[PDB]
Design brief:
Number of domains: 1
Radius of gyration: 16 Å
Largest sheet: 8 strands, mixed
CATH topology: Thaumatin
Shape: globular
CATH superfamily: Thaumatin
Strand content: 35-45%
Number of strands: 13
Order of helices and strands: EEEEEEEEEEHHHHEEE
CATH architecture: Sandwich
Distance between the termini: 25 Å
Length: 206
């Protein structure tokens, strides 16, 4: 599958793509304002994620740090990023279908649209000013809006037992972005697409 990753933000982002124990394609790249990066994701990829990283500093070997979404200090991500990260999530060619969603379960840093570029399904978007509106206790001093599990580490926020409900904090994300997951057991907002669809992830879509 092809993913076109497009930065419409006025600021540079460092895109990242991983399935948690491996990079997808090159794993990461700088995207200046307006730039597009096309990656190839292996068919059958289960639990893939794409995100933006902000305020990164890398040396000549691709080692450094990002203020949001850092993946063990690498330009080319092999692992998932440090919250807060708005997440484009996908599992491809799962019994003949693709499954896509946006998640705020690991917080929010950059607004994003995640849409198919091929026929047969719809896209999802979380484009509200979640950082600007972020509850005081969730504001990441490094930048972005943390999820409550990251901040408070409770069974209720982290859904440790598999029995959690919505919270004041999850309802904040849900109110601003109804089409993204706000907590682990949220009513699913997953879109079913034809197997082997292609996609575009757009940062700052509005």
């Amino acid at each position: 599958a092809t993913f076109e990753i497009v930065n419409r933000c006025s600021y540079t982002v460092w895109a990242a793509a991983s399935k948690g124990d491996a990079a997808l394609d090159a794993g990461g790249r700088q995207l200046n304002s307006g730039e597009s990066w096309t990656i190839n994701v292996e068919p059958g990829t289960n639990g893939g994620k794409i995100w933006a990283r902000t305020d990164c500093y890398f040396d000549d070997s691709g080692s450094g740090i990002c203020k949001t979404g850092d993946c063990g200090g690498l330009l080319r991500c092999k692992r998932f990023g440090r919250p807060p990260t708005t997440l484009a999530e996908f599992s491809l060619n799962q019994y003949g279908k693709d499954y896509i969603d946006i998640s705020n379960i690991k917080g929010f840093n950059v607004p994003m649209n995640f849409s198919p570029t091929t026929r047969g399904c719809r896209g999802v978007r979380c484009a509200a000013d979640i950082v600007g509106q972020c509850p005081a206790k969730l504001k990441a001093p490094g930048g972005g809006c943390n999820d409550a599990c990251t901040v408070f580490q409770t069974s209720e926020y982290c859904c440790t037992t598999g029995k959690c409900g919505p919270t004041e904090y999850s309802r904040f994300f849900k109110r601003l972005c109804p089409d993204a997951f706000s907590y682990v057991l949220d009513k699913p907002t997953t879109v079913t697409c034809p197997g082997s669809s292609n996609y575009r992830v757009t940062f700052c879509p509005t």
